[PDB]
Enzyme design. Structure first.
Site, PDB file in Angstrom:
ATOM      1  N   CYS A 354       0.895  -1.171   0.000  1.00  0.00           N
ATOM      2  CA  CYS A 354       0.000   0.000   0.000  1.00  0.00           C
ATOM      3  C   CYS A 354       0.921   1.206   0.000  1.00  0.00           C
ATOM      4  O   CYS A 354       0.476   2.339  -0.178  1.00  0.00           O
ATOM      5  CB  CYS A 354      -0.970   0.081   1.190  1.00  0.00           C
ATOM      6  SG  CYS A 354      -2.337  -1.081   1.177  1.00  0.00           S
ATOM      7  N   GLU A 355       2.213   0.929   0.184  1.00  0.00           N
ATOM      8  CA  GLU A 355       3.274   1.934   0.269  1.00  0.00           C
ATOM      9  C   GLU A 355       2.877   3.049   1.240  1.00  0.00           C
ATOM     10  O   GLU A 355       2.469   2.756   2.367  1.00  0.00           O
ATOM     11  CB  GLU A 355       3.607   2.468  -1.127  1.00  0.00           C
ATOM     12  CG  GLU A 355       3.816   1.337  -2.148  1.00  0.00           C
ATOM     13  CD  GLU A 355       5.081   1.493  -2.980  1.00  0.00           C
ATOM     14  OE1 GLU A 355       5.945   2.319  -2.618  1.00  0.00           O
ATOM     15  OE2 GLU A 355       5.219   0.770  -3.990  1.00  0.00           O
TER      16      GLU A 355
END
Length: 554
Positions: A354-355
């Site tokens: 999802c960084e």
């Protein structure tokens, strides 16, 4: 006795001779004369310190009496146009002539201002005690109200081109007529930038309370300078603006910025605080003692990271100050019973894949709580409660989809503040208990009157087909199932195992043929993922459909 000629003359002489200071009384009497004797329409006699003022002659176009010590002012000729009373301290302002184009009273005492005539083209008031402004003729192109405390800034003429209030205490601004070009506000309190017409070259706001950038700023000409320095802005807003500014092609109108909360907060890994207290007040009610033991912890720092990050948007205090969702929650972690471990462990994946971005994280905490609430046994067979939460929680879910979708159009806004907007507005439309329920216009940018009810409709839709499938895969629902209905839960895996064994590889194959994607080392993986996902959806819907079911007579 309306004015005659000589009537002035005798009275003037009385004014010069009675109460001479060392010099300057009589010198104006020489001036009073020559303006009468040679009929010259305007007179200064500003410099010469004079306790009071005499009568004025009828043919006067302008009067420059300024930089004096003059407590009060005499009657005005109607004939008058320019008036400068400026620097002499003045506690009251006399009735004005119609045809005055130019008007100035600066560095003076009065709180009260009178009615400005239509013909009036100019108004300067620089240092003052006045807090209240009367009606402006539409004719007026210049407003210097600066430096004297004003809460209430009235309507502006159709024709106003210039506006300056510095050091006033005004809370918000009126929207500005199209003619308006240059604007100045410093040492004020200002909600937000009120739409700024495209004529404008420079507006100036250094008044350190404005929460966000109206995003309507980028419509303004190349050499056009506006100033947002020292305003609180989200680390996100500033960082965004900066990245936006250092650009191959032109920023926008050159905007002047700030630095704010120290050293680069939405660039990766700058700092982490501890037991951040939004709790009922700086009143800790025993806290920071209690969360001290956790300070030595593992996984507590990852958590500390999204404690700042989530603070940043709502630490503006905005909407409800504290305890909006704030103080009640971390008291739940205080007891743990695996909850904290649970909370901390999820907090790490916010910075994992999802960084970097937010708002799933806040959602996910509430889910992990229910996951825990359900698990520790809070649903006995009481499903009804668990019904309304999941249904609510689905709504909240769909809305974070929406924010993410609008927030990639807008670059001045954190993902969460978009969301944080919908939650309070739709609070009525779609039932919301997790709604702090009220603040009106902090609903930021985007957020069309319509798009607000464009969203309601959206969630009104997905709820229909998509929700029944939703509950069956949800979290807490499973946490309740394992506890109350164990066998059927178990038999669900028995069956999940079955498919994995039996049709699973084939189920994939079938799926990949229809994608024409068979070669891809990449798509083969999303093949299982879809099938593995699908049959889970399939299995666990059976499982739910049964658990709650109505058909009797047989």
């Amino acid at each position: 006795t309306s004015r005659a000629y000589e009537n002035y003359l005798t009275h003037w002489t009385e004014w010069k001779n009675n109460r001479i200071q060392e010099e300057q009384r009589d010198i104006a009497f020489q001036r009073l004369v020559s303006c009468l004797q040679n009929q010259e329409t305007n007179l200064d006699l500003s410099e010469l310190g004079l306790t009071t003022l005499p009568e004025i002659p009828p043919g006067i176009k302008s009067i420059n009496i300024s930089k004096n010590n003059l407590s009060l002012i005499s009657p005005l000729p109607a004939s008058l146009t320019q008036l400068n009373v400026s620097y002499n301290r003045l506690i009251e302002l006399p009735a004005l002539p119609q045809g005055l184009k130019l008007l100035n009273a600066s560095h003076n005492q009065l709180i009260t201002l009178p009615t400005l005539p239509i013909s009036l083209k100019e108004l300067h008031v620089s240092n003052n005690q006045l807090c209240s402004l009367p009606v402006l003729p539409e004719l007026l192109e210049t407003l210097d109200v600066s430096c004297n405390g004003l809460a209430v800034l009235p309507p502006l003429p159709f024709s106003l081109q210039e506006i300056s209030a510095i050091g006033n205490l005004l809370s918000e601004l009126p929207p500005l007529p199209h003619n308006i070009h240059s604007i100045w506000a410093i040492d004020n309190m200002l909600t937000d930038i009120p739409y700024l017409p495209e004529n404008l070259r420079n507006g100036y706001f250094d008044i350190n309370q404005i929460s966000h950038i109206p995003e309507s700023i980028l419509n303004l000409r190349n050499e056009c300078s506006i100033d947002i320095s020292d305003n609180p802005l989200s680390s996100h807003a500033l960082q965004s603006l900066q990245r936006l500014t250092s650009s191959p092609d032109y920023h926008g109108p050159q905007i002047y910025f700030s630095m704010s909360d120290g050293q680069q907060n939405t660039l990766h890994r700058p700092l982490a605080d501890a037991v951040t207290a939004w709790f009922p007040e700086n009143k800790q009610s025993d806290v920071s003692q209690i969360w001290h033991a956790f300070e030595h912890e593992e996984h507590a720092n990852t958590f500390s990271a999204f404690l700042d990050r989530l603070s940043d948007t709502v630490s503006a205090r905005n909407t409800s100050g504290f305890r909006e969702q704030v103080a009640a929650w971390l008291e739940k972690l205080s007891a743990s019973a695996e909850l904290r471990q649970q909370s901390f462990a999820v907090a790490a994946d916010a910075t994992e894949s999802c960084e970097d971005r937010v708002a799933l994280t806040w959602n996910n905490l509430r889910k992990t709580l229910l996951v825990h609430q359900a698990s520790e046994g809070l649903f006995d067979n009481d499903t009804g409660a668990l019904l309304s939460l999941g249904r609510e929680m689905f709504r909240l879910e769909i809305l974070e989809d929406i924010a993410r979708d609008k927030v990639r159009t807008l670059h001045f806004v954190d993902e969460i503040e978009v969301y944080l907007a919908f939650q309070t507005m739709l609070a009525e439309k779609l039932q919301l208990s997790t709604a702090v329920k009220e603040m009106r216009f902090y609903g930021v940018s985007g957020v069309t009157a319509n798009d607000l009810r464009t969203a309601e409709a959206m969630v009104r839709s997905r709820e229909e087909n998509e929700f029944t499938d939703w509950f069956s895969l949800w979290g807490p629902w499973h946490a309740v199932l394992k506890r109350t209905e164990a066998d059927r839960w178990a038999q669900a895996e028995e069956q999940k195992y079955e498919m994995l064994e039996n049709e699973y590889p084939q189920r994939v194959a079938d799926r990949l043929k229809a994608s024409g994607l068979s070669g891809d080392a990449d798509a083969e993986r999303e093949a299982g993922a879809q099938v593995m996902r699908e049959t889970e959806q399939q299995i666990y819907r059976q499982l739910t459909d049964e658990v709650l079911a109505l058909r009797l007579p047989e």
